[PDB]
Ligand binder design. Structure first.
Ligand SMILES: [Zn+2]
Ligand SMILES: [Zn+2]
Lengths: 161, 116, 97, 162, 149, 184
C-alpha cells in the first residue's frame, strides 16, 4: 500500500494518474484499484526524485501521457493488470513504455541505421592458395592489376610480380 | 502549408506582421503606410529542413517536344491513354539520392506527367 | 587543361604540346569553321513582325507562361509559341534569305 | 574513404599546417564493443556531432495567442497545463538512428538558453514528434534569431570538429 | 553479360530497388557497383586472353621476362581497353545531362560513359576514341604538374 | 566560388559592340551566412550595394514592381522566402533621390556636394552597367528587366532548380581572330 501524502502537488499528481489509469475503463474489466495504482506510481516517482520539482512534474506528465496514449492501450491494460509493477512503470523509460508496433519500428530503424553507418568491405578474390607470413594463416584475398595479396585473418599485405 | 507575401493596398509594399497587444490578434502593417489588415493564415515563417519538393510541380509539359529525350511505349499515359511517352531524371541540382524517373506523356493537349 | 567534352569536332583532341603549356594550346579541327559575324537588325525586324510582344510594353504577369527570347544576350520581346517560332527560324536559315 | 596520399600528403607533412586536407582518427574500441557492432553504434553516435538540423524536419513559427487555443490540432498542451510559439517537429528515423530522447533534448535546450524558455516536449508514443518552444518573462525577430542560431549549432550529442 | 548486368542494375535503380550501400549514397553505390562489374568483366576478358596465348607469342615472352610490358597491356591490346576514367570517376556530362551529342540524355550505360568495348587491334568507335583521348590528356596534365611540384 | 564569402556569383560580361569603352562586369552575388542577403558589384563602385537599392535607383519605388521584375510568378512562396531577407534589409530607401545618393556615395570620385554625387550615380547607372541592353536616355525599363532576369537566374541557381553553368563549356566562349584583335 502506497503511503498517503499531504502534499497538494503530490495529491494532484496522484489524482491525475488515477484519472489516466481510469481511461479506457480497463480498471473495471481487470478489477484493479485505480486509486491504489495511481498512489503507488506517485510514491515511486517521489522516491525516485525525492522532490516535486520540474523533474518530478515532467516525469508525472510523461507517465500520464503514456498511460492515456490510446494508440497503445496494451501497456495501460498491462499496468492495470499488474504486468508492470508500479515501481517498474515509475522507472520505465519512454522506449520501454512504447507500444509493440512502435517498439518494433524503433528497433528496425536502429538496426538499419547501424548497418548504414558501417563501411563496405574491400573487395577481392578470397583464396587459400597464398600463405600469409605475418600470421601463418592460409585464408586471404588477391587482387590482379602485379597480383596484390591481402591476408584474410592475419591481414598480411604483399604483391607478386 | 507556406506563407506568401501580401503587399500593401495604398503603398504596395512588403507588409510585416504585428501582434495586436490590445485585441490580442495578428495584424499585417506597412512600414511606410499605416495600412492594417486582419491576418487569416495564423502563420509567419516555416522552414523545410528536408526540403521535400515535388519535382512534378517543376516539370513542364513542353519537355515532351524534345528531340534529345528518350521515348518509351511501356508507360502509356493515364488521362489520354496514349502510348508514346518520355522519361528523365530529376535534372535538378541538390538531388539528395534518387534516380526516380518522371514520365511525361508525348501528345498535344495532354501534358500529363506521372512517376512510377 | 583537361580536354572538355564539348570540344567534339571543333578542336583536335590529339594535337597539343606536351610541355608546361599542355592543354592550353589548341588546333581547329579540319572541318571547324568560325563565325565571322553579322548584324542583328534583320532578325530584330523579322521577330518584330511576328506576334512577339515587345519587352517595353507587356504585363509582367504574362512573362511566366511564355518564353524569353535573347538575341546576342539582349532580352528583347516575348513569345507565346516557341515550337512554331523555332521552326520558322530554322526553315528561314535553311533557305538562306 | 579519402586519404589523399602522395605528393599532397608529403607536402602537408613537411609543411606542418594548422589545417590538413583529410584529418582523421582511428579510434580503437576497448570494451566488449570491440566485437559486436551493436555496442559500437552507440559509441560512434556519441563521438559524432549531432545538432538540431540533423534531427529536425520542419520548423514553423506561429502567433498562437492563447496557449490552450492551440491553433494547430494537438492534444498535448492541455494535458501539460507569450502569444507565439515554435513547433519544431523532429524526424523519427534520424532520432532513432542517433538514439536520442525528447527528455534530454528538452533539458539541453532549456539549459543552454537558461530559464528563459519553456520547451513542452511531446511523448514518444505519438506519430508526430512535435515540440513547442515558447518564451516568457523586436520580439518577433527574436524567435527567428534564436531558432536560427540553435538550429545552426546546438550540439545535442557528440563533440565538435568530428 | 557485362552489358546485360549493367542494364539490370540501371533498371533496379530506376525502379528504386537498389538500396544504398552502407556509408554511401544511392548514386555512389550505383556507380561503385557499375565500376565493379566493368572491372570484373575486364579482368575476366584479360585472363581469358592470357590463357589463350601460345608459348611462341612474343608479348607473353616480353611480359614474363619482365623486360618491358605487363599483363594489362596484353589485355588492352587483345581483349578490351576498358573504362576511361577522368579525375578518378567515369566520363562526366559535359553537355546537359549527357556526354556527347550522339548519346541520349540520362544514358549511364557503359559505352555512353566511356567503356571502350573494342580493343586496339580491332580499332575504336569514335566516341570511345574521344574518351580515350580525354584519359590520355588527364595523364599528361598529371605528369606536368608532378614534374613542376 | 567557395573560397569567398559569397555562396554564388552571377557574373555577366557586358560589352555593347566593339565600343570605345571596355567590357563592364556585373557580379550579382549572395552572402552565404538573417542570411541570404543579395549584393551587387557595379563598375566604378568599390563597395557593394543591395539589389533593392539599385532597383529603386532605376526608378522603381513600388515594392510590387521590383518583385515582379525579379520574380515572374508569385504562386511559389518557396522562392519569395529567399528574397524577403534582402528585401527587408533595405527598408530605409523609398525615394529615388536617396537611392542615388547612396549609390553615388560609394563612387570612386565622391562628389564633394550632393548634386555631383547624384549626377555621378545616374551616369554610372546609365552608361557603365549593362551597356549592351541600351545606353540611351530612356532605357531604364529594359535594364531593370535584365537585372531582374539576372537575379531570377541567381535565385534559381541557389534553389538548385537549375544546375550551375560550367566555366569550360565552349558554348560560353568566343574566339577573337585577326579581325577583333586588330580592331582593339
Ligand atoms: Zn502600406
Ligand atoms: Zn497523355
Amino acid at each position: 500500500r502506497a503511503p498517503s501524502t499531504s502534499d497538494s502537488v503530490r495529491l494532484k499528481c496522484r489524482e491525475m494518474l488515477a484519472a489516466a489509469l481510469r481511461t479506457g475503463d480497463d480498471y473495471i474489466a481487470i478489477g484493479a484499484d485505480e486509486e491504489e495504482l495511481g498512489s503507488q506510481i506517485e510514491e515511486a516517482i517521489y522516491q525516485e526524485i525525492r522532490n516535486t520539482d520540474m523533474k518530478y512534474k515532467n516525469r508525472v506528465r510523461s507517465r500520464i501521457s503514456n498511460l492515456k496514449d490510446a494508440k497503445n492501450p496494451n501497456l495501460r491494460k498491462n499496468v492495470l493488470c499488474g504486468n508492470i509493477p508500479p515501481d517498474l512503470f515509475a522507472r520505465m523509460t519512454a522506449e520501454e513504455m512504447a507500444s509493440d508496433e512502435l517498439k518494433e519500428m524503433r528497433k528496425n530503424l536502429t538496426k538499419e541505421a547501424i548497418r548504414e553507418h558501417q563501411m563496405a568491405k574491400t573487395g577481392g578474390t578470397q583464396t587459400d592458395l597464398f600463405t600469409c607470413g605475418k600470421c601463418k594463416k592460409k585464408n586471404c584475398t588477391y587482387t590482379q592489376v602485379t597480383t596484390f595479396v591481402v591476408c584474410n585473418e592475419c591481414g598480411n599485405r604483399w604483391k607478386f610480380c | 502549408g507556406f506563407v506568401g507575401i501580401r503587399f500593401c493596398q495604398e503603398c504596395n509594399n512588403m507588409l510585416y506582421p504585428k501582434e495586436d497587444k490590445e485585441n490580442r490578434i495578428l495584424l499585417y502593417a506597412c512600414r511606410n503606410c499605416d495600412y492594417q489588415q486582419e491576418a487569416d493564415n495564423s502563420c509567419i515563417y516555416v522552414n523545410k529542413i528536408t526540403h521535400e519538393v515535388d519535382e512534378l510541380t517543376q516539370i513542364i509539359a513542353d519537355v515532351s517536344q524534345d528531340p534529345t529525350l528518350p521515348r518509351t511505349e511501356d508507360h502509356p499515359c493515364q488521362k489520354c491513354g496514349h502510348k508514346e511517352a518520355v522519361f528523365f531524371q530529376s535534372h535538378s541540382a541538390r538531388a539528395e539520392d534518387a534516380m526516380r524517373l518522371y514520365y511525361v506523356c508525348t501528345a498535344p493537349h495532354c501534358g500529363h506527367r506521372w512517376t512510377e | 587543361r583537361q580536354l572538355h567534352n564539348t570540344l567534339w569536332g571543333m578542336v583536335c583532341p590529339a594535337e597539343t604540346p606536351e610541355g608546361h603549356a599542355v592543354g592550353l594550346v589548341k588546333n581547329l579541327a579540319l572541318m571547324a569553321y568560325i563565325s565571322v559575324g553579322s548584324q542583328p537588325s534583320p532578325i530584330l525586324e523579322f521577330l518584330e513582325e511576328w506576334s512577339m510582344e515587345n519587352l517595353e510594353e507587356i504585363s509582367p504577369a504574362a512573362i511566366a507562361d511564355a518564353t524569353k527570347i535573347f538575341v546576342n544576350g539582349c532580352w528583347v520581346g516575348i513569345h507565346k509559341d516557341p515550337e512554331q517560332l523555332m521552326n520558322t527560324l530554322r526553315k528561314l536559315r535553311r533557305q538562306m534569305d | 574513404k579519402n586519404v589523399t596520399l602522395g605528393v599532397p600528403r608529403l607536402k602537408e607533412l613537411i609543411n606542418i599546417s594548422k589545417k590538413p586536407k583529410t584529418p582523421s582518427l582511428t579510434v580503437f574500441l576497448l570494451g566488449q564493443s570491440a566485437r559486436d557492432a551493436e555496442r559500437a553504434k552507440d559509441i560512434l553516435c556519441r563521438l559524432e556531432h549531432t545538432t538540431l538540423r540533423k534531427v529536425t524536419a520542419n520548423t514553423a513559427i506561429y502567433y498562437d495567442p492563447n496557449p490552450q487555443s492551440t491553433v494547430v490540432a494537438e492534444d498535448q498542451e492541455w494535458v501539460n497545463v507569450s502569444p507565439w510559439l515554435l513547433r519544431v517537429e523532429l524526424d523519427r528515423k534520424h532520432m532513432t538512428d542517433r538514439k536520442l530522447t525528447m527528455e534530454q533534448i528538452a533539458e539541453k535546450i532549456n539549459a543552454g538558453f537558461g530559464d528563459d524558455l519553456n520547451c513542452i516536449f511531446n511523448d514518444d508514443n505519438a506519430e508526430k514528434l512535435v515540440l513547442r518552444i515558447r518564451i516568457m518573462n523586436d520580439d518577433d525577430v527574436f524567435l527567428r534569431c534564436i531558432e536560427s542560431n540553435m538550429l545552426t549549432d546546438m550540439t545535442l550529442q557528440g563533440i565538435e570538429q568530428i | 553479360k557485362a552489358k546485360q548486368d549493367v542494364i539490370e542494375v540501371i533498371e533496379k535503380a530506376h525502379n528504386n530497388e537498389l538500396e544504398p550501400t552502407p556509408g554511401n549514397t544511392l548514386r555512389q553505390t550505383f556507380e561503385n557497383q557499375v565500376n565493379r562489374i566493368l572491372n570484373d568483366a575486364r579482368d575476366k576478358t584479360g585472363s581469358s586472353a592470357q590463357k589463350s596465348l601460345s608459348e611462341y607469342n612474343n608479348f607473353k615472352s616480353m611480359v614474363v621476362s619482365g623486360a618491358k610490358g605487363s599483363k594489362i597491356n596484353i589485355s588492352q591490346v587483345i581483349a578490351v581497353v576498358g573504362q576511361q576514367n577522368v579525375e578518378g570517376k567515369r566520363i562526366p556530362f559535359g553537355f546537359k545531362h549527357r556526354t556527347l551529342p550522339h548519346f541520349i540524355k540520362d544514358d549511364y550505360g557503359p559505352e555512353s560513359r566511356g567503356f571502350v568495348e573494342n580493343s586496339y587491334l580491332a580499332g575504336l568507335t569514335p566516341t570511345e576514341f574521344f574518351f580515350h583521348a580525354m584519359g590520355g590528356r588527364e595523364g599528361l596534365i598529371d605528369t606536368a604538374v608532378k614534374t613542376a611540384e | 566560388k567557395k573560397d569567398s564569402k559569397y555562396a554564388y556569383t552571377g557574373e555577366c560580361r557586358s560589352c555593347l559592340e566593339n565600343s570605345s569603352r571596355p567590357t563592364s562586369t556585373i557580379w550579382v552575388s549572395m552572402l552565404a551566412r538573417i542570411g541570404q542577403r543579395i549584393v551587387a558589384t557595379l563598375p566604378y563602385i568599390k563597395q557593394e550595394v543591395p539589389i533593392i537599392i539599385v532597383f529603386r535607383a532605376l526608378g522603381f519605388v513600388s515594392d510590387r514592381d521590383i518583385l515582379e521584375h525579379i520574380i515572374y510568378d508569385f504562386e511559389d512562396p518557396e522562392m519569395m522566402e529567399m528574397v524577403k531577407p534582402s528585401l527587408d534589409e533595405a527598408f530605409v530607401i523609398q525615394e529615388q533621390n536617396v537611392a542615388l545618393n547612396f549609390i553615388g556615395s560609394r563612387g570612386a570620385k565622391p562628389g564633394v556636394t550632393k548634386e555631383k554625387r547624384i549626377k555621378y550615380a545616374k551616369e554610372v547607372l546609365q552608361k557603365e552597367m549593362l551597356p549592351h541592353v541600351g545606353v540611351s536616355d530612356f532605357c531604364e525599363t529594359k535594364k531593370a528587366y535584365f537585372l531582374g532576369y539576372m537575379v531570377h537566374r541567381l535565385l534559381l541557381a541557389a534553389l538548385g532548380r537549375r544546375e550551375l553553368d560550367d566555366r569550360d563549356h565552349y558554348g560560353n566562349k568566343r574566339l577573337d581572330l585577326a579581325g577583333p584583335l586588330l580592331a582593339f
